Amino acid sequence: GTSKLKYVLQDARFFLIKSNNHENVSLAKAKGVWSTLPVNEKKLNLAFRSARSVILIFSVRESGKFQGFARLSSESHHGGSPIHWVLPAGMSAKMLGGVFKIDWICRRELPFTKSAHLTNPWNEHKPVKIGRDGQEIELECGTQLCLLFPPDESIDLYQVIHKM
């Protein structure tokens, strides 16, 4: 192991990402991209310039779990291959903001039952599983949450350390 992981998380910022469906998280896992609404896009872009690592922790609504976490490797950008998200009905892809490139750090799941002892001071100390899409997670909460995930032996953090 967890040492390179701890190095990546040192002084990171953490954001809760809530997805309405598994297909979008699977797309993000396969393509290494994420997109969010502009209010969250601006917060993530500000954070990306401000911190060594900005970590997105993903949870699909009604799943009762986190599905993994990833590190921003770029600010948002527009143009390029349109990502075929499953949009929330109404659902203009034009309503989305730009595309963030992300490097996955752990693609394994963690059930909420394992994070019930972690509260997020930036969301009224509610359990860290609770929060709107884009909710920032305080440093210590976010670090301990990431350390709870089962190690993902498929990922080599040597590559993402060099991007810091």
Binding site as annotated, residues: 18-20, 34-35, 85, 133
Cα–Cα distance measured from residue 153 to residue 17, given in angstroms and rounded to the nearest whole number = 23
* Annotated binding-site positions for RNA: 18-20, 34-35, 85, 133
Q: Is 138 exposed, middle or buried (0-12, 13-18, 19+ CB in 10 A)?
A: middle
Torsions phi, psi for 126 (to 5 deg)? -70, 155
H or E element at residue 71: strand 65-72
Both tokens assigned to 38: 């502009």
Cβ neighbours of residue 77 closer than 8 Å, sequence gap 6 or more = 98, 99
**Looking up tokens 């929060």, which residue turns up?**
131
